Write a protein that binds this ligand. Structure first.
Ligand SMILES: C[C@@H](O)Cc1ccccc1
Ligand SMILES: C[C@@H](O)Cc1ccccc1
Lengths: 310, 309
């Protein structure tokens, strides 16, 4: 069965475009897919179909500034003022669109890239449905967020011109490092995947519209959510639930595996239930890389089944 | 990649809701999925994913009176005057939404139930892109369309009240015998699948809205398209291209396999290339039945790869 869910964003502007996919039979879990920056939720068709095959409900939206939400609003790569809180709020609102339908099922959030940061930030909030946490394309300790991005220059841009296009230098600082292991054949988005076909499709897909200029306030929202996802409060408040981590060892977003290992090591030192899948030689989208897609999906199904059993 | 396509229907009322799904890489074929009565195209996610995995473009719409097209128009289970020609015209218009994108690829039409009748009618028309024909849930020589439906009664209703709701007695005649091998607990749509879970999901899906009352003119469109798909002109003008048939032996739409075997026998006697998959013990939706789904999909992929060869 299919549901179209729309709701007004926390930003008061966008009609958030959302879908729920129900399998035949009695489902055993809900999986919420939270897409990343410059993509959309219907890009996950293969994973959605795999999760339905496994007997799970799947629910996802196109976030503010993204995919169908942007197509219908006309506004790309901006989520309003307080962008981090807008997208966290909207992911919590999405959970409540199934209120009364699946109240006794376990709920797993799967978040990729920006979605991994949103999922991590949601975990710190009391209202959240979250019986397991699955992260992919994990943004953790990359040089740009950790060191290159000049917070004083960003604060100055926010004080004077928060709705202007993000200054080019600040965008370059935030993603400093993303091209470190790329050739000119790979192109500027080669970090997306080792698969040239995945990268070419990424650049073609009209519901990604990747590369639309971000506003200053949107860039502020990425710095904010990076802090919320990677800061002490995340580790201190992470609920006592199963966690799984998926990343490419060549993904700049996780500092080429080093950052993802640090996330796993800190959660494990504090006694958390942590499963780590680091794919050697693969880049950001390990759920789309032909080499790893089947292992990511099967691992995710086994993980959701383990959450449901507990 | 994903495309949203809309175009105005041949009926002049509906914004036909449609999608094109493009695989990563260089595709080798296009597969057009044509859904059946009371369902929608977004109910083929598993098949769409399988065909993308095989390197094919997939294109589909929600027909007039169906799925998102009905959700957006507010009109369910009516397609306007001349309903058969509306839905045939719209499937040809859908093909032209990819003009210039995949002009050198082979094009396979996959039609399920009403879609199998639309696909058969399209095959007879000049200009249709059609390198191979795949039919599922095949409506072929069932007792209701063949003999129970009273054409004189229908013609009187069409002459005086074509836009009014179809008389219930005529709807019952058209689908006479569809409950013949069901138990009471299978319920009135038990013919959909042996799987009770498939049937329950069919009855719950908001984009099916199954059971919305048909207009008289829509019923007439089903009789019309039945005759276009099963009549002499179909057999006489079907192009000499690969054909594959999928059906359950317990599907009333194909007279419990008898009708489908006769379609295959007539096409073969006429010199056609016919591949027949008749699934014993399974009902209408052999592409959804858990027993047969993987076989239908893997057989479709092999077929499309043979059309491409
Ligand atoms: C953080 C993730 O969403 C990955 C990403 C980095 C730069 C641009 C788009 C995406
Ligand atoms: C003809 C096919 O679309 C099958 C069918 C028969 C009766 C009602 C709905 C669907």
């Amino acid at each position: 069965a299919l549901q179209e869910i729309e709701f007004t964003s926390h930003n008061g502007r966008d009609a958030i475009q959302a879908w729920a996919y129900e399998p035949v039979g009695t489902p055993t879990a809900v999986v919420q897919i939270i897409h990343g920056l410059g993509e959309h939720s219907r890009r996950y068709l293969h994973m959605i179909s795999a999760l339905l095959d496994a007997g799970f409900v799947v629910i996802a939206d196109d976030h503010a500034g993204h995919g169908r939400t942007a197509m219908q609003s006309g506004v790309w790569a901006d989520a309003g003022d307080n962008a981090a809180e807008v997208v966290i709020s909207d992911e919590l609102t999405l959970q409540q669109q199934l209120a009364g339908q699946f109240d006794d099922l376990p709920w797993v959030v799967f978040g990729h890239s920006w979605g991994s940061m949103i999922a991590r930030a949601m975990a710190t909030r009391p209202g959240t449905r979250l019986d397991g946490l699955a992260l992919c394309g994990i943004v953790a300790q990359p040089r740009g967020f950790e060191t290159t991005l000049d917070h004083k220059t960003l604060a100055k841009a926010m004080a004077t011109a928060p709705t202007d296009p993000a200054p080019e230098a600040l965008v370059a600082q935030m993603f400093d490092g993303f091209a470190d292991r790329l050739s000119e054949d790979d192109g500027p988005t080669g970090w997306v995947a080792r698969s040239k076909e995945v990268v070419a499709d990424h650049g073609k897909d009209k519901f990604n519209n990747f590369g639309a200029p971000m506003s200053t306030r949107f860039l502020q929202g990425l710095a904010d959510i990076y802090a919320m996802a990677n800061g002490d409060s995340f580790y201190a408040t992470m609920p006592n639930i199963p966690i799984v981590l998926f990343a490419g060892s060549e993904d700049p977003a996780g500092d080429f595996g080093t950052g993802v290992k640090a996330v796993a090591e800190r959660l494990r030192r504090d006694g958390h239930n942590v499963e780590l899948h680091l794919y050697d030689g693969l880049r950001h989208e390990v759920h789309n890389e032909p080499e790893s897609r089947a292992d990511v999906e099967s691992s995710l199904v086994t993980f959701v089944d383990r959450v449901a059993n507990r």
